[PDB]
Amino acid sequence: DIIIATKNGKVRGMQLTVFGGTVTAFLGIPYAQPPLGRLRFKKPQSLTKWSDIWNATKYANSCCQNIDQSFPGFHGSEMWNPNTDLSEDCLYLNVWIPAPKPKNATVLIWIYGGGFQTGTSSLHVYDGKFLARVERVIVVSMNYRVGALGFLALPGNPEAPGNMGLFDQQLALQWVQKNIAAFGGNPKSVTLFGESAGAASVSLHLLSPGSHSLFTRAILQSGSFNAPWAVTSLYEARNRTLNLAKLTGCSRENETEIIKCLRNKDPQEILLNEAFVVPYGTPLSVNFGPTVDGDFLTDMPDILLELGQFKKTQILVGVNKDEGTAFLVYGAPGFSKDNNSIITRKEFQEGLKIFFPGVSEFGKESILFHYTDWVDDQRPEQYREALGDVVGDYNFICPALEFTKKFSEWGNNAFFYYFEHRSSKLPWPEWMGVMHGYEIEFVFGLPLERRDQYTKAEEILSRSIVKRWANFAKYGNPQETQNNSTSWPVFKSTEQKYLTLNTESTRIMTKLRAQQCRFWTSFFPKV
Amino acid sequence: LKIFFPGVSEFGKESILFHYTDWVDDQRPEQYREALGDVVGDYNFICPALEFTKKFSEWGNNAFFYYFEHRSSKLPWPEWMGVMHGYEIEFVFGLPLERRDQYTKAEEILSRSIVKRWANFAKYGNPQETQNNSTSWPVFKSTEQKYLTLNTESTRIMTKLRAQQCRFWTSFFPKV
Amino acid sequence: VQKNIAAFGGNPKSVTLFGESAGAASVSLHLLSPGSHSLFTRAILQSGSFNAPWAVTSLYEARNRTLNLAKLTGCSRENETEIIKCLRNKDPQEILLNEAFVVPYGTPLSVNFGPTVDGDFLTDMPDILLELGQFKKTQILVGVNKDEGTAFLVYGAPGFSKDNNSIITRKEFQEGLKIFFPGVSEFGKESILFHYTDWVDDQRPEQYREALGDVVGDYNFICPALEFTKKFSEWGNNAFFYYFEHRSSKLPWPEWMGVMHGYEIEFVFGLPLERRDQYTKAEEILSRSIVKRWANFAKYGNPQETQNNSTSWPVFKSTEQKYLTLNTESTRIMTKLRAQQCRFWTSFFPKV
Ligand SMILES: *[C@@H]1O[C@H](CO[C@H]2O[C@@H](C)[C@@H](O)[C@@H](O)[C@@H]2O)[C@@H](O[C@@H]2O[C@H](CO)[C@@H](O)[C@H](O)[C@H]2NC(C)=O)[C@H](O)[C@H]1NC(C)=O
Ligand SMILES: *[C@@H]1O[C@H](CO[C@H]2O[C@@H](C)[C@@H](O)[C@@H](O)[C@@H]2O)[C@@H](O[C@@H]2O[C@H](CO)[C@@H](O)[C@H](O)[C@H]2NC(C)=O)[C@H](O)[C@H]1NC(C)=O
Ligand SMILES: *[C@@H]1O[C@H](CO[C@H]2O[C@@H](C)[C@@H](O)[C@@H](O)[C@@H]2O)[C@@H](O[C@@H]2O[C@H](CO)[C@@H](O)[C@H](O)[C@H]2NC(C)=O)[C@H](O)[C@H]1NC(C)=O
Ligand SMILES: *[C@@H]1O[C@H](CO[C@H]2O[C@@H](C)[C@@H](O)[C@@H](O)[C@@H]2O)[C@@H](O[C@@H]2O[C@H](CO)[C@@H](O)[C@H](O)[C@H]2NC(C)=O)[C@H](O)[C@H]1NC(C)=O
Ligand SMILES: N=C(OCc1cc[n+](Cc2ccccc2)cc1)C(Cl)(Cl)Cl
Ligand SMILES: *[C@@H]1O[C@H](CO)[C@@H](O)[C@H](O)[C@H]1NC(C)=O
Ligand SMILES: *[C@@H]1O[C@H](CO)[C@@H](O)[C@H](O)[C@H]1NC(C)=O
Ligand SMILES: *[C@@H]1O[C@H](CO)[C@@H](O)[C@H](O)[C@H]1NC(C)=O
Ligand SMILES: *[C@@H]1O[C@H](CO)[C@@H](O)[C@H](O)[C@H]1NC(C)=O
Ligand SMILES: *[C@@H]1O[C@H](CO)[C@@H](O)[C@H](O)[C@H]1NC(C)=O
Ligand SMILES: *[C@@H]1O[C@H](CO)[C@@H](O)[C@H](O)[C@H]1NC(C)=O
Ligand SMILES: *[C@@H]1O[C@H](CO)[C@@H](O)[C@H](O)[C@H]1NC(C)=O
Ligand SMILES: [Br-]
Ligand SMILES: [Ca+2]
Ligand SMILES: [Ca+2]
Ligand SMILES: [Ca+2]
Ligand SMILES: [Ca+2]
């Protein structure tokens, strides 16, 4: 019976057998007051404190959110869907600790993605027990509010100030600072890591002064705040809040009355109307996301980045070879996970309309122009791949690369990776390639489980990635020093070296997507 | 190894075996087949070419190094033999520019570019293709050791070709 | 020392650790242990460092040896705590008598029960900590003796004896490698043979005798010491490296064993300053100088002898790799000690 005394009371964990060893898991520890009733849309409130023992022996409720119903019965989509009951009462976290209890272990804190609209820490691919077992780090993950319930903004108004889900995360980091030493952890060696919106969140914690003292360094997988889906403008945020009020019959004159009316609506009515606060959504639509609130975010984050206003520390940043492909089957014409998705020029053009709704004709043409000068054989998969690269480069790769350059210009060591391995177990079709989100299971060491039907090469790759991540967290340097591995050089804005991650030849390369990113970063913002 | 290294000691043959047979790591059946190809290739061609280039460039002259990675669509030899010895020649001499000869369009494009780089090298001492946004070919220095890959798809700048293997052949093996 | 030494007139803020062999390995481990960071100022490592192959026991070995000891003492249980409790009732003699056999094949340098990665004193594999700069930032003084390996040859190697010149044949040399490299492949032993047996070139009969001494010395002491020093200095700290080349006039061991492992210690502790002890005048002078250099290192972080026109001791950088020779005659600055041999041991041999 493993009981840990926290600042708020006792918690009971459970023993897990992992790899002929033991891990102690505490699943579903509360870290805030349930944000119900008058607390909906408000910042998370501190916890009351309890006598008796809290049983942290099962995952807690996931936060309210719309579920992906595009492919019912299909494991490729459904593996991302919540695997616990949805509730507003969802502010809980998980802790995995090595057995026997470590003395001063580095802590890795996971922040899930899901476009700030979806996600939960209880997903199978986020199971921290392997990292705990293999590297003897402590792994922490938390649920945070998503969608309108987490990011509804009426700027300056504390009844709905925006960024609630980010403050949820922040309160969790705080919990780690105050409690993790009791679990055998070192609060002075905390590394945040997250993927997609989780990665954007991480990058925002690097920018928020309230988060400065709550962590040591950061790992950003397929995401950063400067991605075009990551930050909602104040103009948009108010138009969307008002549109939601209209849909729910909560339109008032007094802005506080609106929020009070929204506070009486059932979560389903809010969730059902979130989709329509925008006239034209994209498959990457972030209806309710981070805003410049003047609290968590003191200024427009591009300005803070440009002018060196962020936590000075090491970062590890990276992206996957085919970031954009997954999004094409959620709207783009001619695309399907059930055929090779050979699309014509006209279908490509229509595709741009879907992914670039408010963009001028000239703007769409310029994308077409940059991505359609073939080299040079008229392969039929020409437009199919171009559209994937368009969506991937614009939304993920180029912003990640720009973030890394800007951050490193202020003197901090940065390491950049390019993930190129397609899972042998991928349920999605071959044309989709090395997909968005499919490095995660390697980071969390799923292929170390020899039962799971991954190949031997995949076990080796995962083991190496796990070691590099752990060394980064512990020592700020993502080397694998024992097995004649390729040394990972720092990324400087000059040479721009990056490391390829694959099952065969691990290589040092330079200037990822140089041509494409000049288009997106320099030219396209003017459009 | 006996066939390719007749007068070499048992220990010498073992050391080759040792360097080329620590797999990474799946027990693919083509393991030894490919290792022997790389042994013969690295020892007889690649490592000496790389050593020559380093030594020559140390005396101040510009040098350019390429790695040819395209297998002819018309190759009569089997697939396992890959990008064979001698099969860059037809690209240098511009055979695939003849649209009758049943080479692919990509191969025509590659040959045209190689022909231009060779010609510019001969005329001007600099193997650039300057007109078609081509990858710039950097000089090879004994330090960074940059080289250019020649292929039908992505033309790239890389460093330290066969670093591990060539240290074995160039430093250790001559002592054997 | 931190809590009490001020009462003895000492300065707890000026503490220098020094040790030889396993003592030196211990010192190097204190540089790595966070619990030892605030307990000393700098470090002197004589003929030893944690990265020497005898210095750290793997977790795999440690458990196999613990269990083997339990077996020998009749303390085998299922519960691991019961084992220790059974071992706690054994008389020390029974434990000591069985320590030798927890290993199937020991060497003259067998460290049956040594440091391990415990997750307390040592938070991680120390090669990883060294490589990634995770250690106390301060000055070190490191060094080795000219004939580290010779002493170990008379404790097992065939044809060797302290009572004759120990001229061994090729076959005896090969058998010697078996003794010193038990779990190593045939190819691995061959590669050692190959590297150390291309003579230059006269067929002197003491050829194999000296080669085996150098093999054991370079592998176990010199190359690890040099690697430690390079790695430690790459993170910006001043380091000083010495090569001790003086054979004591009072050495009871035979001449062929040369400048032996452990025989710099008496010079460091200043025994030859005692004019009664039958050391030579030159040895008194050398010891006095070494004592001053050690003291200046401890007091000021710089092992100079500044008063008697002594050779200045340059810092060791991973580039030039300068080191100072310690001898009774000409004190010299040299570079890249055992360059050829150490490339073999440090780069190639670990793969074997
Ligand atoms: C901010 O406000 C309006 C949004 O109007 C919205 O009303 C919501 C309740 C919801 O139904 C949503 O779909 C709807 O768009 C935007 O103006 C819209 O643009 C259309 C263009 O056809 C106009 O017809 C309307 O003014 C309005 N929608 C409709 C059909 O009523 C406005 O553009 C927006 N600001 C933006 C997005 O920049
Ligand atoms: C690949 O599939 C798409 C998607 O739509 C189809 O999916 C098929 C697997 C099948 O189940 C079919 O019933 C379903 O409609 C195909 O695009 C569709 O093409 C048809 C005409 O051919 C159009 O009428 C549809 O609008 C269009 N759907 C979309 C989403 O635009 C596509 O043709 C197919 N490509 C192939 C066969 O290579
Ligand atoms: C870890 O375990 C065994 C050690 O077995 C040992 O039993 C001890 C009580 C002691 O007597 C010791 O000498 C003995 O070796 C190792 O296996 C040994 O290897 C020999 C090879 O001949 C085998 O016969 C046995 O399995 C065993 N020894 C004997 C004779 O019983 C095992 O290899 C070791 N792991 C290592 C050292 O890698
Ligand atoms: C140097 O001595 C060794 C060690 O063994 C011998 O030591 C001698 C001083 C003497 O007291 C003798 O009784 C003792 O055995 C000699 O090696 C030995 O050689 C003999 C045969 O010549 C072998 O039968 C022994 O196995 C072997 N001992 C060992 C430890 O292997 C060695 O020959 C001698 N060398 C000389 C004389 O130069
Ligand atoms: N893109 C979204 O919805 C479409 C969408 C929904 C769910 N997913 C999960 C997923 C992830 C990687 C590969 C395949 C599926 C992707 C895209 C947001 Cl993030 Cl909710 Cl805005
Ligand atoms: C906590 O869990 C244990 C499981 O054995 C149980 O004994 C205890 O009553 C639980 N406490 C609850 C349910 O409040
Ligand atoms: C853990 O390490 C920190 C520095 O990282 C140290 O200050 C602290 O005392 C340690 N905690 C322990 C071992 O209790
Ligand atoms: C808005 O309503 C709130 C709650 O009744 C009230 O406190 C405030 O006075 C109102 N604001 C204005 C200026 O109408
Ligand atoms: C190092 O290599 C060995 C096999 O030689 C393997 O067992 C181990 O998992 C590797 N370590 C890492 C971190 O990749
Ligand atoms: C340059 O590109 C054009 C097509 O845009 C082509 O006709 C020409 O052959 C190319 N030149 C070289 C030398 O590759
Ligand atoms: C081992 O024995 C100790 C002492 O009796 C006891 O505390 C412990 O429960 C035992 N462990 C197991 C799991 O058998
Ligand atoms: C310096 O030289 C003098 C003799 O000239 C000697 O007495 C003294 O011991 C020397 N000092 C040291 C530290 O070697
Ligand atoms: Br995702
Ligand atoms: Ca690519
Ligand atoms: Ca590698
Ligand atoms: Ca090109
Ligand atoms: Ca010498």
Ligand SMILES: [Ca+2]
């Ligand atoms: Ca002198």
Ligand SMILES: [Cl-]
């Ligand atoms: Cl209310």
Ligand SMILES: [Cl-]
């Ligand atoms: Cl911190």
Ligand SMILES: [Cl-]
């Ligand atoms: Cl057109």
Ligand SMILES: [Cl-]
């Ligand atoms: Cl830094």
Ligand SMILES: [Cl-]
């Ligand atoms: Cl470059």
Ligand SMILES: [Cl-]
């Ligand atoms: Cl020139």
Ligand SMILES: [Cl-]
């Ligand atoms: Cl490089």
Ligand SMILES: [Cl-]
């Ligand atoms: Cl101190």
Ligand SMILES: [Cl-]
């Ligand atoms: Cl022989």
Ligand SMILES: [Cl-]
């Ligand atoms: Cl210094």
Ligand SMILES: [Cl-]
């Ligand atoms: Cl020199």
Ligand code: NA
């Ligand atoms: Na709900």
Ligand code: NA
């Ligand atoms: Na948006």
Ligand code: NA
């Ligand atoms: Na040992």
Ligand code: NA
């Ligand atoms: Na005793």
